[PDB]
Amino acid sequence: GPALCLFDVDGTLTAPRQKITKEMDDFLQKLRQKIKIGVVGGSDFEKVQEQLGNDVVEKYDYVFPENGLVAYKDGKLLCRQNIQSHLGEALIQDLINYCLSYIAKIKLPKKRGTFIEFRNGMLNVSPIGRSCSQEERIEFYELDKKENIRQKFVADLRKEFAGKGLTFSIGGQISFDVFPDGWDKRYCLRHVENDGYKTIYFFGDKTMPGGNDHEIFTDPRTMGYSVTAPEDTRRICELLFS
């Protein structure tokens, strides 16, 4: 029946950490004539606007910044919930109180500010502070390998809040994320289940276990494809829909 194409953005539609090429932009739009298309990323709407254009809500049938906790369908904003409503204020606090009590114990070269960034669907936690300078960031990054700060930190939290239904992911140089079980990229599948699609195709460049696309790739709701590079994604879309 009717189908929908779901695309991860970074590394899938674009070269990593760069805007999309217009060659691909035109290909996607030529493909939109055949079926509906959608995009999903962990970055905020502004970053997705940067990587794929300002008009992005107007050129894609769905746009799912922040893994889908901000969700646009056909130009209009959907239905949204945040981390406070879902977990409840007491667990939030109990988790915030723990992270602060833990960071106060870490011994570091330098510490700065914004130790917990409250996002829409996660708590970013940085032992050094997100306010860090670019130099202090690389310096903390390198010490974290040597003495396993973030790793040991995530281990204590997994144990202390086991069963409270949270996932802990480490990314980048300074931080790790804390988010509710299932609020990775398969969160946006909430918005495409009831819209009557026979097949929902997904494309992502990190379908390996431990990658940002794995859980949405292995989800039964998606016929998932594993893409190596943007050109591969066009290679695969050329074969299915034409």
Added chain:
Amino acid sequence: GPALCLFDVDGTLTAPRQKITKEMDDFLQKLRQKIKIGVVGGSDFEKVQEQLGNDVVEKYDYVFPENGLVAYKDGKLLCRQNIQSHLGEALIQDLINYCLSYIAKIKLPKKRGTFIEFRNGMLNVSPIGRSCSQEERIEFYELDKKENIRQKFVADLRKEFAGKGLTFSIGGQISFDVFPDGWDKRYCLRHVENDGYKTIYFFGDKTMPGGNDHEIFTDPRTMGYSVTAPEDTRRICELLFS
């Protein structure tokens, strides 16, 4: 003896939350043919570029962003200072940890994010965090007025770190500031007291207590004038210098 005029930027030479007008700017450049000019405000340099224009460091003899922590003189940088450099990594770590542990002990209805905001000349501390919504600030302030939460926090901080050159001033609805003693507008005087000016005129709009210009206005090294708007600063300058 030669004289120097120092203005606060917001309210004195500009309309509040507005860029300087072309008339004010031009007026000042003609005052600069009679006397030496200097501007001081608590905003960082880039905002100060938004208020007075991007060429600001040629236009005045002295440009003192962030109350003088940044200091340009005669077009060039004369000095830079932050509180990490001044108190040193060790004790500002001790001051961060104490604040992190103390916040974990606070039983609040809602905790959010950005409890410790790092700024170049002050730490901004908020038990509930600055990311919270206005509606939640009010909820915390109605709690705070009853249960004296910032009052008690500041107390213990004052018993912990005040033989170390720190001042604590509660302010606003949710937070309070932690800064080295005398890092108000009074700070920039160390840069001009050595250039041999007999009288140092100061023009500010908030010279009464609880004001950002109060202490520089009360300072014996400054011949201070309280100003109600830019039309008034001009009127006073005329009566003083021509």
